[PDB]
Amino acid sequence: STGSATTTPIDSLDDAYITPVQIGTPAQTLNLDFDTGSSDLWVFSSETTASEVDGQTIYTPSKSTTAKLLSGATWSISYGDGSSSSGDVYTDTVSVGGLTVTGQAVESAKKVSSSFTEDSTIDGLLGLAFSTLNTVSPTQQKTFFDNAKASLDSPVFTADLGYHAPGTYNFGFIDTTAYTGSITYTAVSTKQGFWEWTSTGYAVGSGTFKSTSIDGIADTGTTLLYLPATVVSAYWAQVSGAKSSSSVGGYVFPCSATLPSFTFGVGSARIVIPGDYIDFGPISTGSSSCFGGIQSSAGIGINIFGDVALKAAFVVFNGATTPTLGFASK
Numbered sequence: 001s002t003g004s005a006t007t008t009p010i011d012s013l014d015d016a017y018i019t020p021v022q023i024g025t026p027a028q029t030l031n032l033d034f035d036t037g038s039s040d041l042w043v044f045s046s047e048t049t050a051s052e053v054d055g056q057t058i059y060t061p062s063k064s065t066t067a068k069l070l071s072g073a074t075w076s077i078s079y080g081d082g083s084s085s086s087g088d089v090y091t092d093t094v095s096v097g098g099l100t101v102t103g104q105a106v107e108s109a110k111k112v113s114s115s116f117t118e119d120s121t122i123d124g125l126l127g128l129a130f131s132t133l134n135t136v137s138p139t140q141q142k143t144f145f146d147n148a149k150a151s152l153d154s155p156v157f158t159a160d161l162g163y164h165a166p167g168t169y170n171f172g173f174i175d176t177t178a179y180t181g182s183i184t185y186t187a188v189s190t191k192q193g194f195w196e197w198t199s200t201g202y203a204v205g206s207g208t209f210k211s212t213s214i215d216g217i218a219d220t221g222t223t224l225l226y227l228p229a230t231v232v233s234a235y236w237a238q239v240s241g242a243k244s245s246s247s248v249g250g251y252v253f254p255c256s257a258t259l260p261s262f263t264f265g266v267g268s269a270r271i272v273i274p275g276d277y278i279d280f281g282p283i284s285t286g287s288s289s290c291f292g293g294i295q296s297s298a299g300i301g302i303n304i305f306g307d308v309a310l311k312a313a314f315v316v317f318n319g320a321t322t323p324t325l326g327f328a329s330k
């Protein structure tokens with residue numbers, strides 16, 4: 001089997017991408033944030049505290065003839081940005097782009113933190129990291145991809161995120177028309193539960209490529225590119241008027257600037273992030289200070305190849321017995 005679903009930016013800045021997901025019988029379609037940095041499939045629901053729902057579409061398990069309470073199971077997650085959610089668990093049928101999994105754990109939110117409430121466009125998350133990170137207790141549950149894997153034509157999914165445009169998540173096949181050149185594959189460590197890999201270096205604009213190992217994670221659920229303060233300082237030094245504000249939350253630049261590209265290495269291959277992908281617009285409405293899309297990871301504990309980096313590439317998440325990552329230009 002295979003699946004192919006379109007993923008759409010939630011706003012004009014590509015802050016996140018939403019993908020329609022059919023849950024239950026008859027289907028209830030919710031728009032979920034596919035997140036290769038986590039491993040829970042959780043949804044706003046009829047059980048979510050009413051004051052914490054503000055425009056999201058909810059899953060109502062009592063209206064699904066295939067829903068079953070997973071007795072005794074609870075979940076609770078905290079994300080790197082400080083947001084969180086928790087609740088109980090049902091199993092139900094879940095389909096993505098025509099690919100159907102029966103008995104998928106659907107984690108129903110009883111509580112969500114304010115950032116989720118305040119974003120009416122995201123109805124939940126669909127985690128695509130390794131199932132060892134799934135938070136369901138006392139019996140850990142499998143991700144949608146782990147459940148689907150054995151049925152797929154090939155044990156892979158691909159992320160093809162658009163710049164200010166829709167893109168595609170495919171399951172079970174590699175669309176050879178979706179990228180240029182070849183796909184370069186690179187080793188993955190699953191020791192932390194992430195799609196963790198090592199970039200071979202970087203360049204700023206037309207500058208020379210610096211060969212240096214940069215360990216990090218491929219994370220579709222993080223908006224920006226978070227890298228070593230050294231690498232990040234080298235990039236912002238090429239933009240006139242750039243400064244790092246503790247008060248705003250990182251590097252900002254004058255909105256009148258033209259940003260240079262940023263290149264990262266994948267083995268001997270190179271992925272070029274155009275300068276325009278690094279512009280996240282005014283810090284507040286009407287400001288002439290703009291927020292940068294490349295930021296320091298120094299306070300995170302890990303480097304994160306988030307959407308800014310991933311949307312410059314066609315990315316293969318190869319879930320074979322020894323997982324690997326693939327990157328191609330497009």
Ligand SMILES: OCc1cnc(N2CCOCC2)s1
Nearest residue numbers: 003004005022096097098099
């Ligand atoms: O081509 C693979 C597909 C993409 N979306 C599909 N559907 C199936 C019907 O329910 C809406 C979603 S099939």
